[PDB]
Design an enzyme around this catalytic site. Structure first.
Site, PDB file in Angstrom:
ATOM      1  N   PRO A 109     -37.874  -2.012  -1.753  1.00  8.02           N
ATOM      2  CA  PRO A 109     -37.422  -1.804  -0.380  1.00  8.02           C
ATOM      3  C   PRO A 109     -38.166  -2.616   0.661  1.00  8.02           C
ATOM      4  O   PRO A 109     -37.821  -2.579   1.834  1.00  8.02           O
ATOM      5  CB  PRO A 109     -37.645  -0.305  -0.183  1.00  8.02           C
ATOM      6  CG  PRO A 109     -37.576   0.250  -1.577  1.00  8.02           C
ATOM      7  CD  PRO A 109     -38.438  -0.757  -2.270  1.00  8.02           C
ATOM      8  N   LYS A 110     -39.181  -3.357   0.243  1.00  4.50           N
ATOM      9  CA  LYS A 110     -39.985  -4.113   1.200  1.00  4.50           C
ATOM     10  C   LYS A 110     -39.893  -5.627   1.100  1.00  4.50           C
ATOM     11  O   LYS A 110     -40.738  -6.322   1.648  1.00  4.50           O
ATOM     12  CB  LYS A 110     -41.463  -3.724   1.076  1.00  4.50           C
ATOM     13  CG  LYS A 110     -41.789  -2.222   1.140  1.00  4.50           C
ATOM     14  CD  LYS A 110     -41.547  -1.592   2.496  1.00  4.50           C
ATOM     15  CE  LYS A 110     -41.816  -0.088   2.437  1.00  4.50           C
ATOM     16  NZ  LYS A 110     -43.200   0.188   1.973  1.00  4.50           N
TER      17      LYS A 110
END
Ligand SMILES: Cn1cncc1[C@@](N)(c1ccc(Cl)cc1)c1ccc2c(c1)c(-c1cccc(Cl)c1)cc(=O)n2C
Ligand SMILES: [Zn+2]
EC number: 2.5.1.58
Lengths: 315, 397
Positions: A109-110
């Site tokens: 998610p990053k």
């Protein structure tokens, strides 16, 4: 169509499908610097990727090779490029490719490169039908995930999908009123749907923002918000504010209140108010309670404020 | 004794107003940990006890510069950074680069450089502006005419032009997207090389300013939460473009300064989020910038002896909570050493120990006087001397 991680995985070197093509090693030069001692699984894939790439082989076999290169270093923008290339020539079913990208994001998610791809797809198909559910799921694991929010403002602006956003906002604000990203997302939905010029809306927000302060007095979010949507037309232009805050003063104090009042005094003096000198002291007095006691870490700053005020509203 | 340890400091812990939320719980874990840290140095304190591990941090750099484990494999497509962080960290720490190492390095960046301008993540990768700001920065650190001539200024400038947008924004890379950072990259790069055509940055001063929101800070693209990585890039990019004023500089200063943590001492990257390793440069690194502006306008209330952030407290953080024994510096306690923070904690510390505006030059050096780091230019984050050598060199083409 294997998988980088199956226990049954095999290098590309020990493969038949890839027998006809010479891998291309890296060129760190005769005397390598900040060189990485790639594993043997990692190095393999890329030697065979360079190869494909180097010959611009728009092949269905390479298409999947790129999926392994991506997974080994999803921050590799070059590989991500060669994939969109293969997606368009090979003409791959972009919805099957949306399911792919939904998966990597859930896994990392990053990454900044893994969301751009999903932005490319969504505009490649003109379909935001999903997204928001997706984005909500990601932010449901980390609600202050920059990229998600960015990609979420995109999907909203680009496809005019406001409607239920201020609604989602309010939800998250309950889950954690300290979520500074949701106080942003909120100003995003409002200043673009009804702006704050509207006396009723700016009023609705200030009460909420105020009854939110009173609930959790030391939350710095509900403060920067009530200080930033008002400092627009002028913090000085709203009388009744400067008092109420002096009311919350006992059972709701915090340098976030004391700071605020200083901000108010400063603008008042700026709009040439009354009791001039009197206010000019109500400020320098507060600049000290802060600089010397209630907010020492910021002393060097609360003194600039002090000196700035004196040098410009007393002489 | 030390700010972080004065008794009254116990009065700077989080107050969740008895209303627990995820943010509260997470910031609680941090303060509590960082408490033990300040507290162990509360059983002793015999001679000068806050020391920067020059040597330990030196093997770390010294070595990674020649070879990295299979760990840094995800940095596979971002190696120029590895060259910058290390050469700039060695620089600050004050270690010469063997004239041999330099050529070796000039030779590497050489291989990344695209036949159409800009640099790639490593040899044989498409040009992108992150590694391009890194290369040029790393080559300017080296400051030998060998380093300087590596950069193909023409193709550098054509490339930048290929990323330009009508609204005055720069794409991060070809096909990629645009955030403030890409602007700071194109300018920082096109600055040092002296390759700024008269219409190269048109509308950029404007597009950058459009990223400042209700917090006073700046976000990646208009409408984003305020962020320190970007807020630096915005201002520094504008400072180069000479438009610092295009910003509501007052609400900015108010935002930055408020980001430093009253208990921790270091800076947080966004309101209501954990303190962090870097941000000792991405945030604190802004005050030097705002000073030049606020002073460029006249404003007689600017201290002549200090930046506008608590320097003592920031140093007391970087030195007491981010140094790994092994070497290199950390995010926050127990977060793993990495060449990235290893650089931006040493850059922020430097910023927190070095003050000067005009003739005034006043330094503060918490810990032992041996922790005195080398000065670093707030805009390009490279030795203020190397900046001069770079331009002075290229401003002859
Ligand atoms: C957001 N963030 C805050 N602190 C660290 C990070 C970061 N999530 C990150 C992500 C994107 C960008 Cl552009 C900058 C920083 C992060 C976290 C850990 C990291 C690195 C980066 C990076 C890194 C890699 C390339 C560029 C930059 Cl600026 C940083 C290297 C590394 O070894 N480690 C362990
Ligand atoms: Zn960090």
């Amino acid at each position: 169509f294997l998988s980088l991680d199956s226990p049954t995985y095999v290098l590309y070197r020990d493969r038949a499908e890839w027998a006809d093509i010479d891998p291309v090693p890296q060129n760190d030069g005769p005397s390598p610097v900040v060189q990485i001692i790639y594993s043997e699984k990692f190095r393999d894939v890329y030697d065979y990727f360079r190869a494909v790439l180097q010959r611009d082989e728009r092949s269905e076999r390479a298409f999947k090779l790129t999926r392994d290169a991506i997974e080994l270093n999803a921050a590799n923008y070059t590989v991500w490029h060669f994939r969109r290339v293969l997606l368009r020539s090979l003409q791959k079913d972009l919805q099957e490719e949306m399911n792919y990208i939904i998966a990597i994001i859930e896994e990392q998610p990053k990454n900044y490169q893994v969301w751009h791809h999903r932005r490319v797809l969504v505009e490649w198909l003109k379909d935001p039908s999903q997204e928001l559910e997706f984005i909500a799921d990601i932010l449901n694991q980390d609600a202050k995930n920059y990229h998600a929010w960015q990609h979420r403002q995109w999907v909203i602006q680009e496809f005019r999908l406001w409607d239920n956003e201020l609604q989602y906002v309010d939800q998250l604000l309950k889950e954690d009123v300290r979520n500074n990203s949701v106080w942003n997302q909120r100003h995003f939905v409002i200043s673009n749907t009804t702006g704050y010029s509207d006396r009723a809306v700016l009023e609705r927000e200030v009460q909420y923002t105020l009854e939110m302060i009173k609930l959790v007095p030391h939350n710095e979010s509900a403060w920067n918000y009530l200080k930033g949507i008002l400092q627009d037309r002028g913090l000085s232009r709203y009388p009744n504010l400067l008092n109420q805050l002096l009311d919350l003063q006992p059972s709701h104090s915090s340098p976030y209140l004391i700071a605020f009042l200083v901000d108010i005094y400063e603008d008042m003096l700026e709009n040439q108010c009354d009791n001039k000198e009197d206010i000019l002291n109500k400020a320098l007095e507060l600049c000290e309670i802060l600089a010397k006691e209630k907010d020492t870490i910021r002393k060097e700053y609360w003194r600039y404020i002090g000196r700035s005020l004196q040098s410009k509203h007393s002489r | 004794p030390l700010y972080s340890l004065r008794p009254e400091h116990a009065r700077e812990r989080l107050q969740d107003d008895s209303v627990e939320t995820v943010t509260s719980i997470e910031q609680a874990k941090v303060e509590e940990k960082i408490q033990e840290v300040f507290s162990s140095y509360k059983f002793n304190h015999l001679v000068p006890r806050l020391v920067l591990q020059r040597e330990k941090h030196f093997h770390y750099l010294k070595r990674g510069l020649r070879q990295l484990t299979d760990a840094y494999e995800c940095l596979d497509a971002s190696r120029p950074w590895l060259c910058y962080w290390i050469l700039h960290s060695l620089e600050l720490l004050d270690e010469p680069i063997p004239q041999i190492v330099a050529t070796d390095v000039c030779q590497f960046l050489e291989l990344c450089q695209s036949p159409d301008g800009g640099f790639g993540g490593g040899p044989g990768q498409y040009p992108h502006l992150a590694p391009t700001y890194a290369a040029v920065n790393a080559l300017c650190i080296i400051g030998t005419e060998e380093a300087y001539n590596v950069i193909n200024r023409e193709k550098l400038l054509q490339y930048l032009y290929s990323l330009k947008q009508p609204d005055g924004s720069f794409l991060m890379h070809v096909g990629g997207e645009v955030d403030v950072r890409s602007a700071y990259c194109a300018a920082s790069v096109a600055s040092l090389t002296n390759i700024i055509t008269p219409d190269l940055f048109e509308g950029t001063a404007e597009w950058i300013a459009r990223c400042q929101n209700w917090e006073g800070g700046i976000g990646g693209v208009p409408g984003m939460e305020a962020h320190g990585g970007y807020t630096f890039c915005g201002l520094a990019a504008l400072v180069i473009l000479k438009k610092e004023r295009s910003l509501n500089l007052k609400s900015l200063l108010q935002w930055v300064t408020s980001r430093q943590m009253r208990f921790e001492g270091g800076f947080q990257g966004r309101c209501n989020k954990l303190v962090d390793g870097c941000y000792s440069f991405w945030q604190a690194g802004l005050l030097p910038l705002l000073h030049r502006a606020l002073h460029a306008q006249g404003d007689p209330a600017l201290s002549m002896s200090h930046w506008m952030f608590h320097q003592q407290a920031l140093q007391e953080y970087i030195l007491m909570c981010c140094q790994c024994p092994a070497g290199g510096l950390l995010d926050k306690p127990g977060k793993s050493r990495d060449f990235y923070h290893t650089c931006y904690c040493l850059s922020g510390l430097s910023i927190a120990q070095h003050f000067g505006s005009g003739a005034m030059l006043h330094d503060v050096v918490m810990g032992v006087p041996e922790n005195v780091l080398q000065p670093t230019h707030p805009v390009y984050n490279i030795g203020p001397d190397k900046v001069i050598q770079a331009t002075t060199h290229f401003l002859q083409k």
